């Protein structure tokens, strides 16, 4: 904050909802709890300038969980290849993928 009154007085006004890995009602986790924990712990104290370069592996894993861009593309590639073969009848679906 601009003025860190919360830190001075030791009162939590809005730091309880800043991150999804903090305490949740009934200990309900978030889908990317593990990834946020690893990125937060990697980049603690070292500052933002260092964390942008040294916690890049964790932040790329964390962003993958959030938006699933790499995952969706991979599913897109498998889907596209399967459509081509089944279009020309070169691949036979297994009994469980269709029934």
């Amino acid at each position: 904050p601009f003025f860190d009154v919360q830190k001075r007085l030791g009162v939590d006004l809005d730091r309880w909802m800043t991150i999804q890995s903090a305490e949740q009602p009934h200990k309900i986790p978030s889908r990317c709890h593990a990834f946020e924990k690893e990125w937060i712990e990697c980049a603690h104290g070292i500052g933002s300038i260092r964390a942008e370069k040294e916690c890049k592996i964790e932040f790329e894993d964390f962003r993958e969980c959030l938006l699933r861009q790499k995952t969706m593309k991979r599913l897109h590639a498998i889907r596209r290849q399967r459509e081509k073969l089944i279009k020309e009848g070169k691949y036979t679906p297994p009994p469980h993928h269709s029934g």
Binding site: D14, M17, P25, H26, I28, R68, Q69, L75, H76, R79
Partner: protein, 175 residues
């Protein structure tokens, strides 16, 4: 298909936005906002939040009801405009539809559209969670924590509503 229900609602969600963004008579503008607020309930309801879906719809039905009363009092003319009455309104309505059509056409054919952000077209169902919750609704638990965790949010939101009533009386006193 029924696997594209969210996408179909989202298209209707946009068409309702091109309804009141073209700015016809606020009577018809308020109708588009009711339509988009109804599908908006459906979209939010298909992602696991039913209280949120029925609350925004419930709130926006109250607002438009007041806006209807104000429209007949402050924002009316002899010939209220329909989407087909002005070249300006019609041009904005057709432009919005043609732009939604091409966004839908490309995102369904290529399954990949890039406008500022990279968007995917594999279906909204591909990002859902595969683990069922317990014996409760997660959205209900989160909202119910406004009174145990969000004490500071209750104070500011409570004060704003109280100050809201005071403010509107001052503005409308006149003379």
């Amino acid at each position: 298909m029924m696997l594209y229900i969210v996408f179909i609602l989202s298209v209707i969600f946009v068409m309702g936005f091109v309804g009141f963004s073209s700015k016809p008579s606020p009577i018809y503008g308020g109708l588009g906002l009711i339509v988009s607020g109804g599908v908006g309930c459906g979209i939010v309801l298909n992602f696991g939040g039913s209280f949120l879906g029925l609350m925004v719809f419930l709130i926006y039905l109250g607002g438009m009801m007041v806006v209807f009363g104000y429209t007949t009092a402050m924002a009316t003319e002899q010939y209220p405009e329909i989407w087909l009455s002005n070249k300006a309104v019609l041009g904005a309505f057709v432009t919005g539809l043609l732009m939604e059509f091409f966004m839908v056409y490309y995102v369904l054919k290529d399954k990949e559209v890039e406008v500022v952000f990279e968007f995917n077209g594999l279906g909204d169902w591909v990002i859902y969670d595969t683990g069922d919750s317990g014996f409760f609704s997660e959205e209900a638990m989160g909202i119910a924590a406004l009174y145990s965790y969000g004490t500071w949010l209750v104070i500011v939101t409570g004060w704003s509503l109280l100050i809201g009533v005071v403010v509107i009386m001052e503005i409308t006193r006149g003379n």
